[PDB]
Structure formats: C-alpha cells, structure tokens
Design a protein around this nucleic acid. Sequence first.
DNA 1: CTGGCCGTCGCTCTACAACGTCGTGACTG
DNA 2: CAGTCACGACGTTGTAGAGCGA
Lengths: 266, 1085
Amino acid sequence: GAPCQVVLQGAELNGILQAFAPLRTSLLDSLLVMGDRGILIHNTIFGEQVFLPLEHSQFSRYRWRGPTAAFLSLVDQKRSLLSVFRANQYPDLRRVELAITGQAPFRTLVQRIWTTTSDGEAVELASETLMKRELTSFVVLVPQGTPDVQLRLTRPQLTKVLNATGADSATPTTFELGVNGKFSVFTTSTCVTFAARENAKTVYGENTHRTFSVVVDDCSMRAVLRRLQVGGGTLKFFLTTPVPSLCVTATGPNAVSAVFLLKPQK
Amino acid sequence: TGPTQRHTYYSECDEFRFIAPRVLDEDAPPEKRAGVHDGHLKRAPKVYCGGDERDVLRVGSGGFWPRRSRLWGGVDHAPAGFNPTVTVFHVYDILENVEHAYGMRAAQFHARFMDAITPTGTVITLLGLTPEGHRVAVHVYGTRQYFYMNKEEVDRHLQCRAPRDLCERMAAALRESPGASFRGISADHFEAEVVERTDVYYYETRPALFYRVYVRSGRVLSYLCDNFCPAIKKYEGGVDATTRFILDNPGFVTFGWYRLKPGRNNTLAQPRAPMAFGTSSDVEFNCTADNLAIEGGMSDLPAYKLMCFDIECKAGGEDELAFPVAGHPEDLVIQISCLLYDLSTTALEHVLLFSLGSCDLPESHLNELAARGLPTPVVLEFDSEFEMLLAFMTLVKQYGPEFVTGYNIINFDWPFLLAKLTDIYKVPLDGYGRMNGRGVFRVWDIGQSHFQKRSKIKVNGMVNIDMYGIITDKIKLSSYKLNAVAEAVLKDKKKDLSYRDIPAYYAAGPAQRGVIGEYCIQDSLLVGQLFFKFLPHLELSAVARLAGINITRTIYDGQQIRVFTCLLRLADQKGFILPDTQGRRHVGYQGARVLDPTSGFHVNPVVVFDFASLYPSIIQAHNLCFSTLSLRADAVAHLEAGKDYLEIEVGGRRLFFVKAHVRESLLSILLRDWLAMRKQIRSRIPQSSPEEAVLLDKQQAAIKVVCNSVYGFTGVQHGLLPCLHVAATVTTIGREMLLATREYVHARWAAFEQLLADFPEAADMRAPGPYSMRIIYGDTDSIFVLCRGLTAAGLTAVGDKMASHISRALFLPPIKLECEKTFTKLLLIAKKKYIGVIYGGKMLIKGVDLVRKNNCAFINRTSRALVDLLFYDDTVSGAAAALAERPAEEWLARPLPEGLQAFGAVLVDAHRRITDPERDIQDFVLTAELSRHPRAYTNKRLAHLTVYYKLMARRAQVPSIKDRIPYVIVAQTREVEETVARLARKLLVSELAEDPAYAIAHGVALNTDYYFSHLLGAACVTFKALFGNNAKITESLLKRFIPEVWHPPDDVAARLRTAGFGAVGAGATAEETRRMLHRAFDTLA
DNA sequence: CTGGCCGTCGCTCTACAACGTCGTGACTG
DNA sequence: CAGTCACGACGTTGTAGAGCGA
Ligand SMILES: [Mg+2]
Ligand SMILES: [Mg+2]
C-alpha cells in the first residue's frame, strides 16, 4: 500500500464533480496544497485571491503522513491535476485516485483514472495518469481568524450586488452597513440596499449588528465573481485589520471563495 | 644616364603633408593639446633613433634598419667589384610583365631577347635567392600565350584563306576598338598555325583542325577572347603566360631550385647591367627557358626573410573613443611593430618599432626579451605620420622580405596603411613591391562581390600570409581574437590593450607610449610563434609545386585553378584542348545518401566501415571523365555493353562511360599518379630525419588536398571546365555502393553460424544474448553496424576482415572499404549527429551543439558534463539503457529510473549557477559569422546583424565579412523595450542582442530566461534519442529535474501581510504551516 | 603609351521569425 | 439559449548558421 492515499469514487466522485461543474476551467492553473485536513486549491484572478478548500470529509478514503505538501496544478505546462473535474471532458468517470511517494523534502504525487466500459468493470485510462513533484520552497498566504461580519445572498441578490458596483477604477464603489441593518453598496450611481437579519431585499447573516463603511477602487469584482459563476453566496468581511478585506464565498461544499482587498480608510 | 625604366618609389622627398598629434608638444598649454597639426612642410623626412637623426631616404654607411638592396634610385650601392656567379637559385615567385623593345633600347640586351619583345613581348620574371643569399631576378624571354579556334568554324565565319588572313582579321578587330588602346597593333603581333586537336568533352568528339594563335600580350589575348568572334568557341584563352611557361617546359616548378645552363646553340644567360634592373634584386639575368633546368636533389629552403608586422592606430576626431577610420586624416597610425625573421632557421633577427612621437620601452619588457635571447628592439621615432609610413614602406622596399605575415593584416593592418598612403598622402605604391615601378600592390575586400570567397592582397614579389586566415582554417574557436588564439594554441594567457585605452596612454608622455610599444611587440611575437608552429609557407609551397601555380595564387585563387592546371598539363600531352566558357538554382545535382538512423543509445558494439577516398576511387574505378562520357547511345554502338562501357542512369538520363581499355580517363590518370606519389612519400616518412619528415608530411598533405578537390571541380556550375554529368555520376554510384554494402551485410551475416563460416576468429567473440548484425546508420561513405552478441574486444580485427571481404565481393579494385573504429557506446541522435566512445576509450562528438562554434561556454560545459555522465558513469549508463524498455510516453507517468538522478543533479547545478549575480559574462557570449555583406541578407532580423549595426552606430570597430561577431542576450528591461521602439512586450532574440564589451561596461544584465531555456534546449536536442527521439517528452522529463519555486510578488505579499494573512511553507516551522491550514480551511468555509 | 572582375560539392539539423489558424471565453438579445 | 469579436498558443514555411561527408 502507498504511504499516502486519496480516493474519489461513486457518489463521492459524483459530489466532487457536482462541486466542480460550475468552476468552468478558471481554477485549472493553481497551487494545490495537501494535509490531514484535506486538499486546498489557490489561484489569483485579476490580482485578487481565490481558493477552493476540500475537507477530508469529501473523500471516500484518505490519509496524511508527512508535512504539508504543495504542488502546481499544471503538469508540464499543458495538462493539469484538475483537468479530471472539468466534467464534460470525462463524462465516463468511475474512480480517481491520488497517491504520494518519496521522502518529505522531495515528494511526488501520482493521479490515476478509471472509467465506464459499457459496464462497471472500471477499465483504467492508463495513458491519462499524471505525475507532479512537490514545490521545494513555496510560500503562500492564506485566510486566518474569523470573518467579523457575514451576510448571505441568493443568486438574484448577489448578481444585483455585482450590478451595484461600478465596472472599473474610474467608477469606485463603497460597501456599507447602516444602523438597524441597512446593508448597502453604491458608486455615486448604482445605489442599492438590503435589510439585514442576524422579502426580495432581505439579507441574513452573523454579526450584522455593527455599522461600517469600506471603499474599493479595484475593478475586479465584476469580473472575478462572474467568472467563478457564483450562485447563492456569502459575504464574509475581515473588517478589523489595518487593511480590511472581503471573502466572498459561494454555497455548498463547492465553497469556492475569493478575497478582495479594500481601501484602508482608517 | 638613369635607369632604363623609371623607379616610382620615393628615393628622395623634400615636401610632405605633416600630420601629428598636438599632444606631442610638451611645452604647449592644454588649450592647444587636442587634435592634429595638418600642413605642408618643406623638409626631407627625418627619423630619430637613440638620440641620432637621419634622413628616412638616405642610403649610406649608417642606417637604423637593415637593407638587402643594391640600387637606390639610380645609384649602385654594391661594393666595387661585386659580381657574384650564379649557378643555382631558388625561385619562390613568378611575375609576368610586358616589355617593349623600344623601351629597352638603351639596355644592352643581346639580340635574342630584343627579338622576343620586338614589337612587344611577355617576360616571365623568376624571383629568388642564391644559396649565398643574393636576391635574384631571372627574366625569361620567349614565352607566348596562345588560344585555339576551330579552323572550319573561323574559315566559315571570316572567310580566311590562310593563317596570315586570320592574323590580319585579329589586328583589324583590335584597331577598330573602343578606348583605341591597341594603337599600332599589327598582323605581325600574331602568329597562327594549324594543328590537330580534340575537344576534351565526350568520347565521340572527333579530332579536328584548329588554328593555334600565339599572342604576345595578356591584354590582347583577354580582349580577343571577349570581343573577337563571340560565336566561335575558344580554347585555353584563359591560360596565363606563367602557366604556359611552366607547362611548356618539362619538370619546371613555380617553387623550387633551378640552375642556369647552356641553351640551344650554347647560348648563355646574360647578366643585366645594374641600370637595366627591373627589380630590387642583387643580380638579374636575361635568358630563355632552355637556359634553365630544375636542380633536383637540392632540397632546403634558402635564407628568405619573413616580416611579421602589426600597426596600431589612434583616433583624432572630437570623439577619441570612436574607432579610427583611415580616410579621416586625423585618425593616425601611431606605431608599427615590425619583426624580421629568417625562414630557413626560424631565427628572429630584428625587432623594429616605428613610433609617432617619442617612445621609451619599459625595462621589464627589454629584460624579458633579453632573457628569451631575442634581439634588442630598435625604436624609430617620427614627428609625423607620413615620415613614419614612408619609413616603413622604405624598409619594405629596401629590406624586401619575401614573406609577410601578421594577424588580420588583410582586413585591417594593410588596408589602413594603403588608405593613408594613397588617399591622405598621394604616394604611388606600384614601386614598393619587388619591381621598381608598375607592379601590383593591391587589396581586394569582399565588398558586394557575390562570388568572392575571401579578402585578398597581391604585392608583386611579396608573399602575404595572414595568420588569421590560417588559424580559422585549422582550429575551431568561437572567437579568433589574437589573445584567445594564444590561449588556445600556444597555451599563453596574454594581456591585450583595448583600443579605448590607447588615447590615454598616448597623451601620457613617452613611457606610456612605450607601454603601447610593449603590447605591439608582444602581439607580433605571438604571431611569429603561430607562424612557426603551423609553417604555412611549407604547406602552401607544397601545394604550389604540385599544382604548377605560383604561391600567391595558391593562397588567394581557390581550388579550381589547382585541378585545372594539372588537368591542363595532362590534356596537352594527350592532344586535348580545354574550352573556355563565355561570360560569368540551389543545387545542380543530387548528392549523397544519408540513411535514416536507428535513433537511440546503443550499448552493444558498433563497427564503422568507411570507404577510403570514396569519390576519388569511384572516378578511378569507373573511368569517369569528360573525355570518356557519352550522352548519345549512338556513340558506343561499336562497343560491347558491360565490358566496354558502363551504362548508368543519372539525374533521370542515360549516360555512357567507356572503360579504361577503350580510353583512359584524364581525371583517373591524375588521381592514380597522385595517389601513387602519396603512398611513395608516406613509405619514406619513417626512415627520415625529423627535419626532412616535416617536409614530407607537408608534401603528402598537399597531395591529399588536391586529390580531394577533383570531384568538386567537376560539380561547379559555371566553373572552369564543369561537368555535372561526371559530378552527378560520382554521387549516383556512391549512393548505389552504400546501399549495396547494406544489402550484402544484412544477407550474408544474418546468422552467427554464417559469420563463423567466414571468420573462425569470431568463435571466441560471442557475447551473451541474441546475435544480430544490422546497419543502424550510414552517411556518404560510412556505414555503422550494430553487432549484438559479439564482444567489442575482438570486433576491430574481425571487422577489418569483413571490410576486406565486402570489398572484394562488391567493388572494383581501387575501391576499398575499411574498418576505422568500433564504438562501445553510441548515442545516435539524428542524421549527421552522434556522440560515441571508441573502443580505446576516446569520446567522439559529431554534429551536436557541444562542437558547434555558435553556442556559449556555459551551455557547452554543462552539455559536456551531461554527456560525460551518460558515457562515463556506470550508474547513469545503465539507467539510460533502461529508459529504452518502455514507450517514451509511459515515462511521463512513472518515476524516472534511480540512476538518472546524477544527470538531474547537473541540470540543477547549472540552473543555480546561471542566476549567480557574480557570474562571468564571457561564459554567456554567443557568436555568429557574417556570411555575407549585411545588405545581401534577406532576413534582416538577426542577432549578429543587430549587433553589427549597433557597433557601427557606436563607431566601434565594425566586423569584416567572415568575422565572428560576439554577442550576449540582455535582460528585457523597460529601458531596452524603449530603445527598440526608439529605433522607429516579448522582444525577439535579435532585439535583446548586444556587444559583450558594451554589456560589461554599462552593467547590462543577461537574459537568464534565454540562457537557461537554451541550456534545456541543447540538453533536450541531444537526449531526445533516450526517449523515443521525441522532443516534447524529453523537454518535459528534463524540466521535471529543476526545483520549481512559487511565491507571490513582493508588493502583494506585503499587502496581504498587513491584512493579517498567515503563512504556509518556508519562513515558518512545519507545525506552524499545519496550524495555519487548520485556520484557513475553516475561514474559507 | 597601359586595365579587370570572380571562381569545390550537396545534405542536414536547428533556431528564429513570420504567417495563418485553432480552441477558448465572456458575451447579447 | 448561439452568433461573435477577440485572444495566446500552436504548426508551418523560409532563411540562416554551421556542420558532415566527399
Ligand atoms: Mg592587429
Ligand atoms: Mg572515409
């Protein structure tokens, strides 16, 4: 048996695929990092940070012996370790495995694939098997602590927030919450509001109680959150820090998320 | 009184253009120390030496430089009663000049000679030494050039009744001529006679009557051949008088010992009176060719002098860092180093330094010279450029070195001098060679001339050998700067003064000028050493002797004229005449087969069979010639197919060549006689003295070079005597032989039993595993045979036996297949590209990047390390053998074998070193040759042309055509991206190319992405063959060895840190990275 | 009573640069 | 939900360098 083992099969592989289907080849270039807690995918889109965590709970079987490991998704700058989950590229899947080998400073991941064969006998797609070495000296910065305020939007609501921001640095936008739960965003033009709770314009969340204002010259939101194809999703503010930032998450275990750096207006 | 013919060199001078740096005026205020004085001055030119002073042009009891001259202007300076007897003399050079009886009125020539130049005539001057060291000129009278025209054709065209009619027609045609140059030419300037000859082309060509027409002058002959009757074919009109002299007299040579002797009616060579001398000789004679004989048995070179010289220049314009231009009056020659050697002993005799301004050589340099037993440098000082150049040209005239060498003298040192002497000053050069006037003294650069192979210099009696030309033809170097060549060939590291250092050293007083002096002398001594290592004069004279052309033409005039002249000698004694082509597309015919290689790394023994002198042997074996070919089948109907002629299809046409017993091929006769001669010479090299052995070695090499050229001669479209039927037949037969060898080997020794049936000695060569013997490669005349199941140890001999067996099986007796070598390992990469190790142990590298001049030292060293691993490490050798067990695509999906870890280690180390900020930029210098003039390029966007125009913009030294231009590829900074659009994203290599001197000086960074990509490229190209010959798979697998690193841009990292993001990876203990993930996943949620 | 040029062959790989096309990719009514 | 303007990468040709073999 391999020293480290990961398996997706059946509904679990049906799950991960169900999770990945909306990603739309955005994440395929990425850092992939691995531990006992699961798999984490990381990439920058238009400069802003993007992540997809996958907890060990989503895997049919798992292991993790050795330090954290880190890979780049792109294999030989052409194929990728995530290509498997671009669901229309392989409608035929039945199992996928990851295994790791080599000692802790210089490991290698191997990825293996099996498919339907007019029957469930799971023939191996041997030619498609992938190998990728560990990054020797990677450094990646990741979220920490807890969001200070959370707000929960449906697909209509979140898209209308994207409508409510201006499109570029020539059209800066301010996100706000006013006292007694008046969430808002505006861009001189394109002013909108949602009524917070701890029907169309109501928003649910946590720590909704605190009033604040943050402004954004960054163009990114109109592009990033569209091309991760967000459905329903949460705003998760990190408002407290000298520079605040906003994690906008999706919904379901496809919790693909992007963190937007804001103006440090005191 | 006065010389019969006027001397045109300066024997006296009292007004000249004085040009001199103002910085030499030590008492002048600095307001007045810039630039040059330039004005005419009414003094005789002076030279200063050791506190003494002399007129440059006075010949007398003193003298600051040696002389080997008798006359000066009209004065005879030989001691009274000087009248040496000449019996034997060595000839090194031959001139041909036209004399006129009327001009020779008052020279007291005997009637024999006057007759020969009566209207006018061509005189062959043999230039030479006596064994006592006197300079000799022997003027030979009575050699006429001639050409032929078919009698029937010219009788039809001109209605000639007689040979005298033809002469009348020819004189008339020259009289009514543009330019009116043939004034008073007469029918009696011509003789015509009727002879029977055959045109050399085709076996069917019947003998016919021709008028042979004698002409007294080359000018006449060349005009008649261009203009007389263009419709009527001419034969041998291109042959010069020297050639006629050499061929019309049996055994005569263009380089070698002669004797004077009684001629036809006991006639004797007449000594010329000194006033009738044509040249700066000590003694001169008039004679006819029957007064001459080869002095056989006399061997050794006489005491000829070699001058090795080097000029240095200084710019004078406002920009003193601009490279000097020659045509600019103020860009002066400031020093001329001049070393005089005796060729017979190799001894340095004189060291002469010419300097504009005072010049005190450093004592350290004088002591080094004194230690080495070298003559103390005489330093000659001049107040102006003119006086220095005049003095140098005077030394050249008065000392008259028969040989002149230097380094890049043809491209730089000579042109710069001649430009000054002819453009700035108006000195006629035509008296400054051996003749006293009217001689050639000329440089030809390549220029726009599409044809011209090299730059040339002709000085009428002075053999110029440029060591830059010699070295680039005998050593393969990325750079041919003198100090690189010194390091490579002589094994001396030597400092080399930059042109940009010269101005400061010049203006820093006499001692600093002395330092420039030291450098100039050291340069010239290196060049001396190179010359005496390679002994280029011995090679060249050997070829000159063999080919029957003069030494000068041997050096500058190509390969064709060598075969042409030998073929002419043989055609003559057979009754053939050679026709001249009138006037002045990729390939003319199909060449050699190269088999498709079984590409891979072969660890079983590989034997190489190769045909010795394939194309020469084919020409002999199949009796191939102009004169043996027929296109018409009609031409051979009286002969029997098979036994009288070869019928062969060539270029999609049926050719016939008759066999040797019908008619023997002229080309075959040449090659047979030469190869006999070569075998004879090599049979004596063992039982010879070390001094004699050097000469014999030079002789046999000359023969090899000339034999090898015969095939090419036939293949030249628009050459002297082309025949593309012969050239194409040679390669056709060669193609058939290579395939025949393959078919035979495959059939005959498919099974080990069959090999043992031929070679009992194979019985104890059998190695473990299955026997097979298959041809894996072959190119032109070599074939490579992979011999599974046999041991390398015995293979050499058994293969020599097999080669000899295949020979007598398949091929006619001059043809000989030989077993050259066995490889124990062979990386057969591609056609014309392989790396392997010979059974003795030696690595042979062919075709690949490691042995190409263009690529930089860094990439080459790394490549050589990877190759030395694959071949000379056991572990890696086995791993590379083990890759071959599987299809190449599978290696993308399995761990690469354990042994190839070391090969990985080398790439990792190279990656690490390439990005070292304390790298030496010389390791990154790429180079390419200017093949042609920059405006003869179609694709203008090339790295070396980019650097070429940058150098010219910067007024740096512009490279000559055929020079290798060094460059580095610089980092694409925004400043660079500017300069480019400032010449009207990712930029091409060409745009990021730069002169390495500039790159050093301005601290320009190298393009590491380029150089590392190019390393991985060189690796990938070479080791494709380990991985199914697939470049994409190999690039992938090699790239997997490098330690990849990912971290965000520093600005982003900083900003994220200010927003409370935690770290994973480096910069933290592993447990902190674990901790941080457990926060991350739950905050991403 | 003044003028001339020049003058081995073909095969082959590889890099480089220019040219055209291809699959992707967010997109609007 | 599909006709669509646009973009980075790929394959292909020609040139050029430079060697291979006579
Ligand atoms: Mg020099
Ligand atoms: Mg050979």
